Design an enzyme around this catalytic site. Sequence first.
Site, mmCIF file in Angstrom:
data_model
loop_
_atom_site.group_PDB
_atom_site.id
_atom_site.type_symbol
_atom_site.label_atom_id
_atom_site.label_comp_id
_atom_site.label_asym_id
_atom_site.label_seq_id
_atom_site.Cartn_x
_atom_site.Cartn_y
_atom_site.Cartn_z
ATOM 1 C CG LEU A 1 -2.223 -0.946 1.322
ATOM 2 C CD1 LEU A 1 -2.819 -1.079 2.458
ATOM 3 C CD2 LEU A 1 -2.931 -0.338 0.024
ATOM 4 N N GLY A 2 1.946 1.209 0.734
ATOM 5 C CA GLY A 2 2.835 2.596 0.858
ATOM 6 C C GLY A 2 3.917 2.423 1.678
ATOM 7 C CB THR B 1 5.603 7.011 10.119
ATOM 8 O OG1 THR B 1 4.527 7.705 9.988
ATOM 9 C CG2 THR B 1 6.644 7.378 11.300
ATOM 10 C CE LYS C 1 9.240 -1.685 2.216
ATOM 11 N NZ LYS C 1 9.851 -2.018 1.009
ATOM 12 C CE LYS D 1 3.593 2.214 9.992
ATOM 13 N NZ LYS D 1 3.618 3.525 10.959
ATOM 14 C CG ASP E 1 2.069 13.786 10.128
ATOM 15 O OD1 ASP E 1 1.784 14.652 9.355
ATOM 16 O OD2 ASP E 1 2.548 12.769 9.540
#
Lengths: 301, 79, 411
Positions: free
Chosen positions: C14-15, C18, C21, C37, C131
């Site tokens: 997915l990405g 922080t 991945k 995660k 954040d």
Amino acid sequence: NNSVYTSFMKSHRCYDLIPTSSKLVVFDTSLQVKKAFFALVTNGVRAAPLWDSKKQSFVGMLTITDFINILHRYYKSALVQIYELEEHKIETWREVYLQDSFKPLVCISPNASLFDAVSSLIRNKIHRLPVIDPESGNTLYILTHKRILKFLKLFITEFPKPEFMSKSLEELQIGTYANIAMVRTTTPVYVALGIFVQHRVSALPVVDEKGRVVDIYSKFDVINLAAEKTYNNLDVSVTKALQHRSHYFEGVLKCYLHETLETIINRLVEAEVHRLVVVDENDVVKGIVSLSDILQALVLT
Amino acid sequence: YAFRSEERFKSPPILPPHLLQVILNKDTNISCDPALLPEPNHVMLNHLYALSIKDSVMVLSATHRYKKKYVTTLLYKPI
Amino acid sequence: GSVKIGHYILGDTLGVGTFGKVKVGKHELTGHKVAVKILNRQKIRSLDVVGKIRREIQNLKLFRHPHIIKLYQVISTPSDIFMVMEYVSGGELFDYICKNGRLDEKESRRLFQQILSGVDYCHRHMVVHRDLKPENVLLDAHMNAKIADFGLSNMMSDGEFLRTSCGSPNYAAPEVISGRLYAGPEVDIWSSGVILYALLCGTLPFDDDHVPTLFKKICDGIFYTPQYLNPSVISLLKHMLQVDPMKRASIKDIREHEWFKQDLPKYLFPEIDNRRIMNEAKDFYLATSPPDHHLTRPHPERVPFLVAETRKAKWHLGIRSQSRPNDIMAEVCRAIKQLDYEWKVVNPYYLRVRRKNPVTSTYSKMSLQLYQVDSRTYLLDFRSIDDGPRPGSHTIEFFEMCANLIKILAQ
Ligand SMILES: Nc1ncnc2c1ncn2[C@@H]1O[C@H](COP(=O)(O)O)[C@@H](O)[C@H]1O
Ligand SMILES: Nc1ncnc2c1ncn2[C@@H]1O[C@H](COP(=O)(O)O)[C@@H](O)[C@H]1O
Ligand SMILES: Nc1ncnc2c1ncn2[C@@H]1O[C@H](COP(=O)(O)O)[C@@H](O)[C@H]1O
């Protein structure tokens, strides 16, 4: 008749009674009494827990009653002496106060049931019951007869209600009609304290030549003498002393014998006073119904 | 718009604004019980607030929290 | 073979995230979709935080909210730590805004409400998601709001502030960009403000190609306002994005605002029974700020002091004018003058002292931090403690402990 109100108090701790955020001042027994009483009017509180530096614990309580006793006790004349009080200290006065009788501080855990609190108030005949967390040892809030009644009517539900409360006051025989401690409108504020020390009553409804209630002098009203620093003159009338708020109050809260108990408790928690003076068409005194009466009319009934 | 940026290491740390807001100097309503105070910020809670000593008695206070409750404890102790 | 955690098989990524991945999980049996995660032990061992990670997983664990990505379970192993979370499709809000251009009122209102409840949930639980970006908030199949990355988040402590500053430049509050102490609800409110702005103008309220000029733009409360919307959203944004952390809006302030009230469902904020509820939360439980207003009946015990009034000057703590190092030294001598002992933590101006009760065996500690009020003056702070029958008081012992120390520092 005890099926509901009696169980309710046993099912709820004094914890729920405590305000979300409150304020409490505590005095050291080494502190002078003069400074202590002035601190009471500046902070708004009528009661402070006494702390002993040497014993490192809570020895007792300080209320307006104390100010009443010491005022009536050491007094010579309005104009002649500002003497006794000034120098006197909290622990030194507790010494001459306990000279006659020895009564240690009472307290209740915030985890204890509301039934234990109302018991300690009637059994010990005390209006200030401090809740202290036994684990930390820190005083949280000072329980009051007013605080409980408000909490009772406000929190209690609709459902079990229909039966006993409806019955009128006259028929329920709740409150003392036998001897009513009162003062005239021309009676000095000194003799008012003299009655406050003799009888454990928390207020003295004032009366005129007709015996009608034109005002009321509560044990709390005398703290104003310290607030205005006018306590030096005790020769003034209670009407002269209550003349400071005379432009503010609506009148004297009261009720009638033929009124329902339900109607009395509602008007009482809404007015946020400690009692009501039952009267007639002539507004003459009949009897007094205080929060102590209502609280004592619950625990057993 | 990346990336993640820096921090400030100049000491001593500057006094945060929150602490300068005291609940004891605030004024409540006129109809509430005098012993009541608004719900205090969790950041100023353990901190001590000492009143200027114009009296020979040192008067200092702090707002300590209970499990769900809050209490501001003022203590009058002579020097 | 293939890598899988429990009954969830890994897959497409997915990405970046922080720390580690994130990838999509698929149930071996049913075929459900979750987001895991992946934080490599080797990668998190290099950087050293042994409490920051512990409290992170701790906080997200309990959390159950429709707009907060719900952490299901955490599977661990000497290789890398995993976190399975609720998977939602429709990407980050940053992808939604850019693709849809500039959202309108009837829409932005819906989404902003949702996100603000999620952060309210967090703040009520004493955690701050530092954040907050449209790039950090996802959308489900139904195009709702989901707060995602809690990595930069921290847990709020009683009597404690937060030093650290992190993250990109644009959403960081005017205080954290200046590296100053903060409580943490306000840094979210400011971060939420710039999000509400992006949900309208499509462009960031504070943006520049190079820093600090971005920070210089952020410190200054001046920002472009398009004719795009009504003055109500502007009064909200300007009060929300206020440069003064004290003059800013709280989570309560936004709830009371007009534009935020319109078309707002009850479920979001967990609240004749309306008037009856007053009493339950009314003057009985808390104190109301002064209400120019109808005369109300003052409590009988509050009138006598009041009727005779219409001073009260209460300070912060011990405050002198001496130098930073020259002060603490003149202090510690008095700290050791008594039996009391001092073990100072990281900062030289921050000391932690504790002493044994003279009467009993009890022991109460405290915290003294030296701040700087201005150019010519410094200030000393006194803070109580915590630890986890008794004839003495932890609260009072704290006062006496301070009072004795203060007595020597003054006279
Ligand atoms: N909980 C208490 N602990 C110690 N003394 C008390 C306590 N309650 C009442 N008193 C004493 O009784 C007087 C206050 O009575 P009252 O106004 O009815 O609460 C004061 O003179 C106190 O010394
Ligand atoms: N002014 C009064 N005269 C005679 N008895 C009173 C008076 N006020 C209260 N009482 C009685 O004292 C109790 C209430 O005391 P308190 O809670 O201090 O006002 C009740 O049992 C009343 O019957
Ligand atoms: N029955 C009453 N009627 C009128 N005012 C009262 C009454 N009871 C108490 N107060 C007022 O409330 C204060 C006393 O409160 P408390 O200590 O609770 O009895 C005084 O300022 C009185 O003027």
